[PDB]
Symmetry: D2
Subunit: 295 residues, 4 copies
Amino acid sequence: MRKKISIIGAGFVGSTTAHWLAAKELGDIVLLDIVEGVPQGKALDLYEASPIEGFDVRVTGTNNYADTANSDVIVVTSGAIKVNADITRACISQAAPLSPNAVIIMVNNPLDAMTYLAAEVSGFPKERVIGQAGVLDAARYRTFIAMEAGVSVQDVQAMLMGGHGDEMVPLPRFSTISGIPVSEFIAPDRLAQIVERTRKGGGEIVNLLKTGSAYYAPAAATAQMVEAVLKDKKRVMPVAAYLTGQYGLNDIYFGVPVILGAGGVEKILELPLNEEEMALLNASAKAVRATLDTL
Amino acid sequence: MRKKISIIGAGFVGSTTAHWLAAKELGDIVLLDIVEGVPQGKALDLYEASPIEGFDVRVTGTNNYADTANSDVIVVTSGAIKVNADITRACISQAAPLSPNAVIIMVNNPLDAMTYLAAEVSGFPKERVIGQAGVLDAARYRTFIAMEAGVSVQDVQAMLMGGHGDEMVPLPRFSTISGIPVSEFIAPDRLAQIVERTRKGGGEIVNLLKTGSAYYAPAAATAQMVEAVLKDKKRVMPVAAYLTGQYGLNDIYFGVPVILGAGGVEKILELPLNEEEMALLNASAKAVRATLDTL
Amino acid sequence: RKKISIIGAGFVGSTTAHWLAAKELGDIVLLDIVEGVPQGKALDLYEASPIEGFDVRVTGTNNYADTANSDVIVVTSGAREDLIKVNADITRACISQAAPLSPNAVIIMVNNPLDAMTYLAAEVSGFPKERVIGQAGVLDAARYRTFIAMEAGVSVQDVQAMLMGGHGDEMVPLPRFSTISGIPVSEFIAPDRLAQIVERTRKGGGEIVNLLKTGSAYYAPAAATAQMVEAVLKDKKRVMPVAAYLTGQYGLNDIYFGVPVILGAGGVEKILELPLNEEEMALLNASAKAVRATLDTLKS
Amino acid sequence: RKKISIIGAGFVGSTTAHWLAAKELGDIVLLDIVEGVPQGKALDLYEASPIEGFDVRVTGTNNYADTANSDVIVVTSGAREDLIKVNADITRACISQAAPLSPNAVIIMVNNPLDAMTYLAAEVSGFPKERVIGQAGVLDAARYRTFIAMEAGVSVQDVQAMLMGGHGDEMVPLPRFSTISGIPVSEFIAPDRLAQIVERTRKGGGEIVNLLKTGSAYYAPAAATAQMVEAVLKDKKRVMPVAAYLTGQYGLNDIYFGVPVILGAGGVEKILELPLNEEEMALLNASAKAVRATLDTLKS
Ligand SMILES: NC(=O)c1ccc[n+]([C@@H]2O[C@H](COP(=O)([O-])OP(=O)(O)OC[C@H]3O[C@@H](n4cnc5c(N)ncnc54)[C@H](O)[C@@H]3O)[C@@H](O)[C@H]2O)c1
Ligand SMILES: NC(=O)c1ccc[n+]([C@@H]2O[C@H](COP(=O)([O-])OP(=O)(O)OC[C@H]3O[C@@H](n4cnc5c(N)ncnc54)[C@H](O)[C@@H]3O)[C@@H](O)[C@H]2O)c1
Ligand SMILES: NC(=O)c1ccc[n+]([C@@H]2O[C@H](COP(=O)([O-])OP(=O)(O)OC[C@H]3O[C@@H](n4cnc5c(N)ncnc54)[C@H](O)[C@@H]3O)[C@@H](O)[C@H]2O)c1
Ligand SMILES: NC(=O)c1ccc[n+]([C@@H]2O[C@H](COP(=O)([O-])OP(=O)(O)OC[C@H]3O[C@@H](n4cnc5c(N)ncnc54)[C@H](O)[C@@H]3O)[C@@H](O)[C@H]2O)c1
Ligand SMILES: [Cl-]
Ligand SMILES: [Cl-]
Ligand SMILES: [Cl-]
Ligand SMILES: [Cl-]
Ligand code: NA
Ligand code: NA
Ligand code: NA
Ligand code: NA
Ligand code: NA
Ligand code: NA
Ligand code: NA
Ligand code: NA
Ligand code: NA
């Protein structure tokens, strides 16, 4: 049978994630929400786009968790700390039991903390509970680099760590264009400006939309992670993963480079960060730790 | 240089149309709106999804019509009769002059009437001013047929005419699955139910969403028409076109089968409709005519 | 990941790997009896993956053990009675070795004589008839659709058509069952012009052979084959003409014949029975006779 | 629509048409001196369009007039001094007839000896040097990236690499300029293991030749060529290694050499100058000497 993906939270990010996934014909999609009608309408609307696009994907909406049973992947985009903590706990507690073999991909903020909560509530192997944050952030960074350098976005690669904004750990040294260091194309001061724009990337969209936050890129990032699992592509990407010593961090979810596949986090990469980079990471880890304790 | 597409009205349908088009890497996209920040945010958000998806598309947002100059295609999705008439007149009067060689694709409702208005205000050759309505409606119909018959949406074809809802002219006789009449798969009573669900398709999504109307399918339909023009694919699809005698109708925009290409409507097909079908068409034409006169 | 084994790494088999690899549908194993040939073509295609962006393991081999547990087995190892016996021996050898290793696979035959070889494959494999099919109609319909699109001046994406039987004289054209966006093809193309198109379709394979001088078509044949593989792997429920085992449909029994079917994860999930008129049945009966004759030569 | 002419409908040329047709990038004209060959391959591929869903006019011809006004001209008509003279005469004939008909086109050479043949094409066409390039580095980097992905156990979509020079011994590998999602390849693969990969890359073309016994690689070479065509047609500004005319970069003058460039609608839009260390420059200089020798044999 076809793969099955359940998206919990049929808002901007969740519905847009269904759109990116449907276009890829990766599997049947179930959009769940607590609000009646909303997921049903968005799912049917997207389903009706299928004859036009040519993909055979069963997109259904629902308010009943039973419809998410036996999912291969569970995406959680239901978030609006306390508020999201209750929402996240409610979603995972009802979804996890019905899909014991699924890989959970958290999107709700505060991301690192919510992913940790999902791991606790689900009791799933740590490798199968991850969060999306770094793929989006690296995507904004890669976009800015391509724009500035005047090259194809298909030729820019970048790795970064930590969490959102001030918790983000930029790593320009670990970004290249067709294998060439970005420093060969962009000078230090301009690169520093791009790093700052990346840190503020989410807020930049918020300040523009006025009524909500970003969704096209966040959903694309999430969909790419879902694809990595379903097709066991073994993508090397920054993801919120559970650490057991890497970078000197224990008992915490933190954005780190991993090889993402059908088994979820199949490997946590260990970068040879210099002292400057480690200082940024330590400060981030402390802030992420603070949010974790509050949780 | 790359093709250029301007989308006037950065709301649900317009932004979603940018999404479908960006994924196809069909050309640079300019999202224009009267509201500040909104088009800029949605465009940048989508642009930031490009390194993830791998398409090189310049997606920009704006409030200045000058940025839409020299567009190959102009999509109008700014509508909310009087209200939309003023909005449509304002959009076409400012956009048409800057892109004299563009094909205008209207989406604003009342569709047939607004497309007629766009033709008047723009003064463009009639073949280059069309409206999207039938592709969406036929898509819902094709979706329902595929669902019911249990076959791939890639194998269902369908033609229909007229306008939305009561103005829609269904033509089950002109729908097939891999060349086979749909009547071979679905009985008369069930087919009649599918036709009715198609007529009410837009309202069905509205009643579910509660706060707005459909956009995934409407945008997909619009994007497919944009693709047909940019790539001169010569698609055979129902489109709102200016009639000069076809089906006995003159001086009016009506949903009819056409061959859509780089020159816009490259041919209006003349179906051998029986008396039953012509009765439906005549009633529709009268209703569309009524809306036109009011306009 | 899904696994597809392509037996016979010649033009059709390798080109089929190309179409499938681009779709990132699953791991692909190309097998041949000739050493180096499959390994070279597989590696070549695998080396194109970073350029195209697909993650598919494409490997070549001479060992049937590497095709074990495949979801789909494509047979393109084929090379009058002479033609039949030669391909019967190759098909026999291929199926008897591959089938036992992939008991749950759907076998898609391509070797000619198509209908007869598919029958032999069902016979040798012992597989349920629904999981042993042949590719022929998708290619023939593709040529017909191409000619129609060319002539009518419309996108190939808006032309669909159904046909039955086998290759050439065994082909049962059905213009009545072809449309452009739901509109009969006869509305776009005159009778004489359409008859020529039907004739060109019957001789479509030969037309390519005569142009290439050496060898036959492979781009379209591989695309047709790949589309059937995708139909099974993604359980798309495609409505297409495929060589299937008949037990009464169209008045035919105990024979593989090109017929309209719903193709999904279970192989043939339904054999459609279109009501054909007197003229159309005349063509089908004459076609069935020719297919039956070939089948009898095989059983002898 | 955009128009691409592929001179030489052999394995690489036809496979390039296949990759391009699937991308629906523009009309494709396949030309060859042999009658029937291009017409057959073109028709075959055109007949696959309804199956795949792309609307591309694919035609075969023996008349250079049909390649008129092309946006891109791909040359894959090629067949020691013997090798050079034979290909020089073919390349000469192809360019002198095609270039005049498509004055604004970007010429992408594939024929070997690559660097030398691209130089000859610039010489014969009279085209601005930026619009006459050669494909070699994209393929070589593709093999290297494939081996790295295989070994590191990661997606081919996350491996990028740059290299220069020409084929085999003329290749200038640059492991320092290869990464996996921005992380140095050396962090994933040990020195000895990486050296083997570099060696396998140098001999990558030969490896395929030895396996096929007859003929050389075409899937990856065509994919590499097609990606360069797409770069021009869609003005993507790709950063890739291509054979370009040098006027001082890397200390080389009046010669075509594989170097990092930004490829767009204007052909070579920029030749990047990477600061290479002593060891790397040692490789490049020895490579330039070999390329220069080949060039001199050509000019003689
Ligand atoms: N990690 C990233 O990179 C990233 C990027 C953007 C947004 N986000 C976060 O993602 C979340 C969703 O953002 P959005 O813009 O889609 O929001 P939204 O408000 O549009 O959608 C959230 C949806 O969740 C539903 N919901 C609430 N509680 C639920 C419950 N218990 N069960 C099921 N559904 C429930 C709502 O009814 C709503 O439709 C937020 O927490 C946001 O901060 C993360
Ligand atoms: N033809 C079909 O099949 C079909 C299907 C669905 C919706 N529609 C119609 O499409 C239109 C858009 O629907 P929507 O859901 O995207 O709406 P929406 O309200 O989300 O978006 C419309 C956007 O237009 C902008 N706008 C208003 N006046 C403008 C002006 N003068 N210039 C530039 N921008 C302006 C708004 O500020 C808004 O962002 C409506 O008229 C709707 O009825 C047609
Ligand atoms: N529409 C159709 O159904 C259709 C269309 C085209 C071609 N065909 C048929 O498909 C077959 C292949 O055509 P081709 O052009 O690719 O041929 P080909 O000669 O290029 O390739 C056949 C390959 O099979 C291999 N082979 C032979 N015996 C084998 C065995 N016992 N096991 C494994 N491999 C073996 C060969 O060594 C060779 O590489 C032919 O029978 C041809 O007539 C059918
Ligand atoms: N990385 C690279 O740059 C790379 C990779 C692989 C192969 N190649 C080279 O590409 C060339 C083609 O390789 P192939 O395997 O496709 O060869 P091939 O022999 O299959 O095809 C060459 C085609 O050129 C045609 N031809 C000959 N002279 C011609 C002329 N004057 N005009 C038009 N057509 C003519 C032939 O008839 C033949 O169909 C060779 O020179 C080969 O060494 C380069
Ligand atoms: Cl956090
Ligand atoms: Cl109206
Ligand atoms: Cl039936
Ligand atoms: Cl530089
Ligand atoms: Na699936
Ligand atoms: Na913060
Ligand atoms: Na400073
Ligand atoms: Na373009
Ligand atoms: Na939206
Ligand atoms: Na969307
Ligand atoms: Na109405
Ligand atoms: Na009744
Ligand atoms: Na080939």
